[PDB]
Design a protein around this ligand. Structure first.
Ligand SMILES: [Zn+2]
Lengths: 525, 256, 525, 525
């Protein structure tokens, strides 16, 4: 080690190993002291009034943490494209991480003359939540990840967590965590850190779209050996009761016996991009589909994976059923549609119900005649199914993943769960990549010349910077399709533009012009 | 088999109300004159609790030849009043005339109304019993010619689709609450043990008939008679599908 | 030996062992040319131009395929009786498919006179889709199977498939499959074909009916140590409230505490075989119960497995919840009820809810006195549950199989599924028996003496015939019941009958008098 | 052997190891003859033609059986405290049962002198249904268990069972079982019996509560990179629709995107212990929430695990969604709340929906405007979800167990089930501990001197006593929590009292003053 010696050599490249591909990324990461050096009780109260549904309580830790739970932190636009134009499936298998070339500096705003000098003798405290003993906040799609553009410098987000809350108050069951109550590595400028992790077995992500629909799997030339009720009345009129039966065939695919049915559903309000056909009313929250917990409602944000809209319904989108990303430079509040990128899951319409339609219809009575009393003459009545739970024989696809989307999530530690694929998309894991917490060490700075039991406070201003390196191994699923006609592929467009898509501008600013999925290749059901 | 108005031609030889078969020739039938002087107030009588009457859904509307009956499906039960356990709505038909003078089913103090609506509720579970109290029907009077109420509007819109007898259609979308008087008015009613207003009468109905009639526009009332017919050919309308009144007998009518 | 020797013997038999039964079957088939040797695109516009619900887009191929996905193709009525009267469970284990005694013939039918000769040359191509790269149409209950009666000669059905469609039009995602893009074997007279397939791990089919009901598993002599709310308002009638509790016991089994609940449900309309108590209206489709996919509706044909009807209500059947077979010689359009055989599932009424009844009741509000809040008050209200999903602790039985019913089905290749047992009955497999595609090799007539350029459309008229054998080993699950009293068994009736059931009549026409299930033996829950 | 020689020692104790604890219990029992040595048909009619819902058909056998399916039969209150205060989980592993020190008795009830003596040459029969060929009645929470007080002497309950029934009648499918049709050991005063059983693999019970809520898993300081629909109208006026989007951040946690959702639900009516605010109506059964099976209604008892009430409203409890135990001395009919102990599951509010609230809200229409057909212009409409089945991404906890609650249950033998954790709590097992049947061998009295065909009906009156021992090893799941602040622990209260909790009174009567769950320690989600 030693100041006059680095501890890392820029590693960023990517290598495709046929059925696999190794991604490597390196980045600089500036880290401030954060909340001085103290933990801070936070709560709905601290934030303010929030809301019953926005009520909380937890703690702001003076620590920071690294994050790369976004495909763009590992795959380049060209990288993705390929992956998606050539594989039916993909999944992470491992990860290797390294921090190095760390430099800690002290700042001295000499009466307006802020002066940065190197504190060669200082340290950053780093550790991983490998035993998963701390609140896991890496599965909440927050900012603070390694930027997609390698040349970009990053700031490292601050770690904070929530616990049980009664309004803005805590309960006895609430827990407090101290990260200093964990063993941690201390690094001087000559030192570095590294660790490796094995992804638990996860299902390949479906990077394809079906070329068939659940309701169209039969032979369009052969009849079924099954019959269906065709008529209930002779017709003419008056006591026409009858029971006619017919064979189901190519002419009436709708009534044919089937072995499997579409996945479950939770209806979402439909919203048109054309704000003239919508409705002159504030319905964002009022018309939102939601769920409740201990007297607190939470928007069904991603919700179950459901087709975003019917064929041609493009302009429509479920109130809260799709992932919406902000375009480069987009503001934080009340921005127009033209500032955001709304994803869609049309591909899964082959097996999943439309998010803004009922699952189907069900009988609600017993049709009858005046055969008993002259009453009881009830006509067959049916009702619409707004939300349908899991049923045997159901099949479904999960939500697609995106270059700018999340990669993994931690499955909640509970007695029971079902199909734990993270609803925002990606791979669910009981033991996902552990959190890597990092925080400099507070310099005690000036102390008094007479004993002071009061804990220290003046601490000398400092900040730290260096380089992080994450490598992830992704196993790939090749395709052996016999499709004759060419497949649909993602390609850039030749048409003379002002700036290359996914590149920097005259001001050196990067831009991801559109979200990119993974479902371009096709396969049968 | 037939109403008195129907048995008016030399042909179409059917049985009129004076010759209805089954158990329709007995003491308790259903349509009685309700004298408010002779009724006694029953404290146990309380306004019904209408559960499922606020939901909006499509309803099957069909030309039952004798009247227009609307299937109420499920989830429209009634638990209020002095009903034994609870009753679930199964059907909704109505009776009218050519004017608000001939009358419609029940009469209060000898006064008739333009139209009478019968919301019939079957007993929820009970058992395999032949005993009475199998139906708890709600009777609402209709007589007004001034203002149009949107509650009956979808019904009138669906009326032309079932012009011919034994024809089926569907109401676009409506709620049972919209077709009923305001809840502040549904406080006074009468209970009497009637059998049935249709042939093959069975003494299994509670017949809770409400005061304070409902108000619909005169145009809707005229459309009711204009858009419906008895026979297959559009010749004989559906004016007077009303059963003549029957003696009260020893039965005692209570008041809420 | 070529053109002079046999490519096979007849076999076709059944060997029963202790815990196994291998069935063997051989039949005589005939293959026409199909599509005049050509591929053609098919759509509703081409055939029917029907409503959107029945719109479709696909392709008809000049290929045929072998179908033996029905039990009667392997089990004799007798064989079937032995199976169902002595085994609690069963499942397929392996298969041996072979083709032979191939004979290709030409057809003269010239100037009026029609003649037939053999083309000792000529070829029939055969190949299995062992890689499952072609649309799978064997799980759609189609006709074209090996005849139940061994003496019957059958014609191979034509293979066709459906892909994505928008109305009658196709989309860029639609796939065109060419069967000639698959390697295949060609066969002259004297050549034979053979392949073996091993079945996947599947659960034994439940060939039994429960001798107990889910709601009657308690000891009828002992009380529970649990209490239930018995009374609430000390009768009277003013402002009297109370909470009285009682022990749940033999007298009130209905309220006893329970560990398991019945399986999921999807209400169906009730239809009576006695057409008088039905209703004087057309409701076959209006009240059929269905589901939707990308704007298209499809009926709930044999949807979830539910008890066909309440005890002693055989006259009733769910509109589209049961399997309906056609009697021998029955037509295909608007036949009477006496011409079809409607199956039922009353055996599963011990654990599955009745198909034509609501699952149960559920509270829909908060009951309270007026004083709470002010002067509102509220009475306890409940609502019917028409469709109920899957809940923890649910228990259910699957659809029964029939001698004329399907055997297996291919589980759709999707990200997720639940209990992938085919809804029409049988065994669901990710890799079921591969499709066996078959075709006569086109033989050009006589080409011009001057080079043309275009494809040949002049061909010799030919067809092929031969024998086919299939052998399947089935594993058996025996019964060790301690039931003292005798059990119900499937039996023929001794009463005189013009004809013997499951036999040919005076004209040699084989017929199956009734559907035969598999649930006659009983065991406890 | 024979008399004079003890057959077994006492053995009653607990042994705590690191990850294991073995409990040992021994008790004194007495066993009468029961149905005068006869099997008898019983039914609703037999009892008193009970309600349709309460109709049943079955048999009563002169056999008794051993029941120790309760936690207090093995764990002392003291022992229970150590288990729940120091372990995050636990599960049964193996067991050994022993019957010993038989001793029967003659009881010559002469005139008034019932004179009891010993019949040394008498026999007791005992056998285990290790093959599970008999109706299993141990999963029904019946009385008759080993007394919690190791000093109380108890009577063996009588074994009875139910089969199929149509009203009070039986069907051909109904089964009759004769226990003498099983090999059984015969014991005299000098004989003993013993057997060992290994528990199947079951999940550890969750003996902890969550310190986080499913809707509070995000970092309270960092914003998300996902947007949500914030506004739809620019303001009041008229035609002014719009689409405004905002970043979901800490200030608006309610609308944040989430990967996992709360478990399913089946709404129950809410009941207040304050009988002034409930209602002046009888709604115990009317508004109870239930499910139907073959036309018979059964109350949804504990039902799905759902939080008993909203944080704070402890006075409320689901009509039939909680376990209710009777206090010592409490009668069986119409007892007051003060006589019973009502359990709750507030601990699971972190992941499970509140039992008496809707799961959430779902869209029901398509908001529309005054476009073509302006008379339309719909409005965002939503509907309440009272019963929600399973959906992918759902997580939940199971119902807690109790010192006085059941331990295990037998999973119904069916084709399918979901998350078969017994709804009343415990471990579900396909092959749970076998039932242990025991019976006094009949001793005919003096027979006649001339041969008679009739079976004997005169028997020497007899009854047996003796000791029983049961040992169970339990696996423990230690906790390695990093929580700083102390945890909640079960503890006795120092405050003076007339008696000691969990002890006997001046009359030697033992009592359990309250139910004790197991969820004291905490863990993150
Ligand atoms: Zn009437």
């Amino acid at each position: 080690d030693g100041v006059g010696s680095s501890s890392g050599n820029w590693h960023c490249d990517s290598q495709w190993l046929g059925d696999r591909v190794i991604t490597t990324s390196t980045r600089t990461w500036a880290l401030p002291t954060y909340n001085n050096h103290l933990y801070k009780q936070i709560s709905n109260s601290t934030s303010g009034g929030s809301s019953n549904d926005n009520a909380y309580f937890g703690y702001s830790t003076p620590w920071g943490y690294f994050d790369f739970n976004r495909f763009h932190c590992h795959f380049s636009p060209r990288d993705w494209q390929r992956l998606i134009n050539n594989n039916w499936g993909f999944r992470p298998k491992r990860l290797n991480f390294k921090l190095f070339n760390i430099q800690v500096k002290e700042v001295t705003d000499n009466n307006g003359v802020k002066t940065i000098a190197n504190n060669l003798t200082s340290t950053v405290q780093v550790f991983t939540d490998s035993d998963y003993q701390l609140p896991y906040v890496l599965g909440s799609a927050h900012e603070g990840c390694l930027p997609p553009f390698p040349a970009d410098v990053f700031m490292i987000p601050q770690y904070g967590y929530l616990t049980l809350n009664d309004g803005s108050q805590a309960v006895g069951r609430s827990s407090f965590y101290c990260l200093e109550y964990f063993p941690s590595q201390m690094l001087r400028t000559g030192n570095n850190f590294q660790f490796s992790y094995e992804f638990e077995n996860v299902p390949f992500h479906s990077s394809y779209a079906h070329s068939q629909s659940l309701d169209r799997l039969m032979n369009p030339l052969i009849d079924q050996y099954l019959y269906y009720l065709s008529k209930t009345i002779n017709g003419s009129g008056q006591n026409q009761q009858t029971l006619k039966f017919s064979v189901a065939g190519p002419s009436n695919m709708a009534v044919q016996g089937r072995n499997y049915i579409p996945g479950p559903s939770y209806r979402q309000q439909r919203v048109s991009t054309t704000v003239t056909q919508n409705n002159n009313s504030e319905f964002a929250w009022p018309g939102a589909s939601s769920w409740a917990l201990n007297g607190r409602n939470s928007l069904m944000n991603p919700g179950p994976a459901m087709a975003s809209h019917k064929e041609g319904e493009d302009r429509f989108f479920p109130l809260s059923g799709s992932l919406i990303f902000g375009k480069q430079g987009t503001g934080r509040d009340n921005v127009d549609a033209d500032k955001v990128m709304i994803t869609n899951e049309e591909e899964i319409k082959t097996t999943n119900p439309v998010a803004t339609e009922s699952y189907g219809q069900v009988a609600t009575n017993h049709q009858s005649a005046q055969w008993p009393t002259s009453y009881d003459a009830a006509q067959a009545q049916t009702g619409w199914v707004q939300n349908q739970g899991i049923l045997p024989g159901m099949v479904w696809q999960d939500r697609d993943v995106y270059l700018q989307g999340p990669i993994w999530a931690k499955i909640p530690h509970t007695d029971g769960n079902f199909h734990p694929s993270p609803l925002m998309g990606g791979f669910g894991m009981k033991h996902p990549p552990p959190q890597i917490l990092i925080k400099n060490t507070p310099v005690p700075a000036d102390p008094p010349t007479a004993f002071n039991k009061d804990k220290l406070n003046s601490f000398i201003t400092q900040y730290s910077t260096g380089q992080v390196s994450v490598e992830i191994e992704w196993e790939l699923q090749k395709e052996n399709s016999k499709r004759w006609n060419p497949e649909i592929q993602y390609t850039s467009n030749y048409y003379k533009s002002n700036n290359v898509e996914f590149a920097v501008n005259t001001e050196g600013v990067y831009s991801e012009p559109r979200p990119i999925g993974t479902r371009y290749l096709t396969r049968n059901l | 088999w037939c109403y008195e108005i129907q048995t008016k031609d030399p042909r179409s030889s059917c049985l009129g109300p004076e010759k209805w078969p089954g158990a329709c020739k007995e003491n308790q039938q259903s349509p009685i004159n309700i004298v408010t002087a002779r009724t006694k107030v029953n404290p146990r009588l309380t306004p019904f609790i209408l559960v499922g009457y606020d939901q909006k859904q499509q309803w099957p509307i069909k030309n039952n030849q004798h009247t227009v009956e609307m299937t109420l499906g499920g989830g429209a039960c009634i638990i209020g009043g002095d009903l034994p356990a609870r009753y679930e709505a199964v059907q909704l038909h109505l009776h009218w005339s050519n004017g608000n003078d001939n009358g419609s089913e029940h009469s209060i103090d000898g006064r008739h109304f333009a139209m009478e609506m019968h919301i019939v509720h079957k007993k929820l579970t009970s058992s395999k019993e032949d005993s009475k109290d199998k139906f708890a029907v709600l009777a609402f009077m209709i007589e007004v010619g001034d203002k149009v109420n949107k509650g009956f509007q979808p019904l009138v819109e669906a009326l032309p689709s079932i012009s011919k007898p034994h024809s089926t259609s569907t109401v676009r979308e409506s709620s049972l609450q919209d077709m009923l008087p305001p809840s502040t008015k549904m406080y006074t009613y009468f209970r009497y043990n009637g059998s049935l207003t249709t042939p093959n009468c069975d003494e299994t109905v509670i017949w809770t008939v409400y005061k304070q009639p409902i108000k619909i526009h005169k145009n809707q009332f005229l459309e009711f008679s204009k858009n419906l017919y008895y026979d297959e050919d559009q010749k004989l309308n559906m004016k007077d599908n009303v059963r003549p009144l029957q003696p009260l007998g020893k039965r005692q009518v209570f008041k809420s």
